[PDB]
Amino acid sequence: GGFCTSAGALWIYPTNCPVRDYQLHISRAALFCNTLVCLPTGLGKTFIAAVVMYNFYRWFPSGKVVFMAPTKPLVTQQIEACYQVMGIPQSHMAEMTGSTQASTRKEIWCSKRVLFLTPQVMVNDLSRGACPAAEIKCLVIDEAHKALGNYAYCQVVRELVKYTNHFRILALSATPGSDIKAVQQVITNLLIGQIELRSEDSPDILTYSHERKVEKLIVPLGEELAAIQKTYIQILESFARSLIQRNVLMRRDIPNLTKYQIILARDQFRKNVGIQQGIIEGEFAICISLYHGYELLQQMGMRSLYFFLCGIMDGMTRSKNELGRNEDFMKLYNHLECMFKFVYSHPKLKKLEEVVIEHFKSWNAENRDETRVMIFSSFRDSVQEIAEMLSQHQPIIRVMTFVGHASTKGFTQKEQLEVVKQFRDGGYNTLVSTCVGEEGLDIGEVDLIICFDSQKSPIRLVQRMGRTGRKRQGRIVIILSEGREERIYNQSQSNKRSIYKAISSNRQVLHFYQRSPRMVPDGINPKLHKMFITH
DNA sequence: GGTATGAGCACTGCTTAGGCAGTGCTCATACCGCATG
């Protein structure tokens, strides 16, 4: 399929940077079989992709190589980083996103050999015949753990296979899935023939990366929030009884239920008439909102609870009317209204402030290159509250929030990049980030990472810890409320080990795609050629 | 329920034109959630 016999004699490996065994072995593996590469962040998933893409570029000179990333900033970062490693002239490559008109993309597809794009552009260009589907010989998928359900990654492969089976897939993920079931879906969706995995624990990784120790700070909930929690549980009980009596909700202890368990109960209901549907849907929507509020109170604090409730109690939803007829709700809501110096709406926030102050004290005492602190909380109200709390210490602490595009106005792609550049240059020394700061964009190495919340899935914890590494031995602090939050953390670490074992096990836990094309003709055994690549 | 993201089209400012290059909007994805190999 257009394979260049002469180029097939060799596979070229860059020596610009010292050769690492794990990068040499994994690169070679990925040439001959569809591979999912799982390395810690900063240990060279991008380098391996560049090596693979450059050799496919050489081996299929009339073919195309495609690199997919989930965000526009990541596309730009990755084309730049891969350009530096590969021996491909700038004129043979292009970035393509929704910022390039579909009309222009057709000309870029035809004139370029390597394309870095968002997967939605690829889906659109395949369906509309702008992408010459048959000419694709290599497809690199970054953040490949996102290749679940009908995500654009899954759509690209399903559409491409209509036109050609003769391409290599390289998937890159530090965190292949939340569990085995998710890892199996990624393998199935992306036609993965094998996994090449190294952990922080891996000896061949320890050489090129400082081990980083996790500190846990357990914070008791305290009298004030305990008392509000106790009032909240009774409000929860009164609004959930209808679902207990309707038998749509199992009846499992009201205080121990989660918003996720009720969204599932609602979903199981929506697949099993008239006035009835309206009242049940209404009861479910009220309970899911209250249990959201309950989670905010336990994990984020009273200010987060208030702001969420204010969004509801600000139009006439049924939720607004019902909750408005409850005196305990309106008592609590009116109390939070009054409440909102700086108010410490969760004991975790006071503990977070102590840790950050002590870090800057200890750093400035050692007197000169500014320290960098990244704090992760999932909710926008928490991130703004944490930022306001730490703003009291300006300009010793120079805090900025890092949030997604949706409006608390939200940040555009351009505004996000300015905050990152400000963080890198020490304009800001402290970043408070939602999940947008966990994935892809090279923020830089950070001296202190703080996790304000915890999830049962291990993915986001590993991503958050990825923002510190070798260059400078970093510190990872995890602030947990005592009880549940401590168990969620213990579960995420157990789930991480479970996935590692399953991937590494001699027994076939995972079902790999067995029909990955060799791509190099069966006659040709390409020989390693190490060289200094010059542009 | 909130958190990201995306594309394509709307809208508007430019120093000098263009589907430029920005932000805004509507419509899609996905996750979270049992616990293990």
Residue numbers in the entry: 73 to 344, 350 to 391, 395 to 420, 442 to 468, 474 to 513, 517 to 644
The paper states:
To understand how FANCM identifies DNA damage sites, we determined the crystal structure of its N-terminal translocase domain bound to branched DNA at 2.2 Å resolution. This high-resolution view reveals a sophisticated molecular machine built around three core elements: two RecA-like domains (RecA1 and RecA2) that form the motor unit, connected by a specialized insert domain (Hel2i) that recognizes DNA branch points. In particular, we observed that the opening angle between RecA2 and Hel2i is markedly reduced in FANCM compared to the other enzymes, all of which process double-stranded nucleic acids. This tighter configuration is likely key to the binding of the branchpoint by FANCM, as compared to a looser configuration, which permits the passage of double-stranded molecules over the RecA1-RecA2 interface in structurally related proteins. While the N-terminal α-helix maintains a comparable trajectory in FANCM, the C-terminal helix adopts a distinct orientation, positioned at ~130° relative to the first helix and traversing an alternative molecular surface. Because of this modified and distinct pincer architecture, we renamed this sequence as the “mincer” domain. Our crystal structures revealed how FANCM achieves this efficiency through precise DNA contacts. First, the N-terminal domain creates a positively charged channel that grips DNA at the branchpoint. Two key residues in the Hel2i domain—H369 and Y332—make specific contacts with the 5′ and 3′ sides of the junction respectively (inset 1). The newly identified mincer domain provides additional structure-specific recognition through a long helix that contacts the 3′ DNA arm (inset 2).
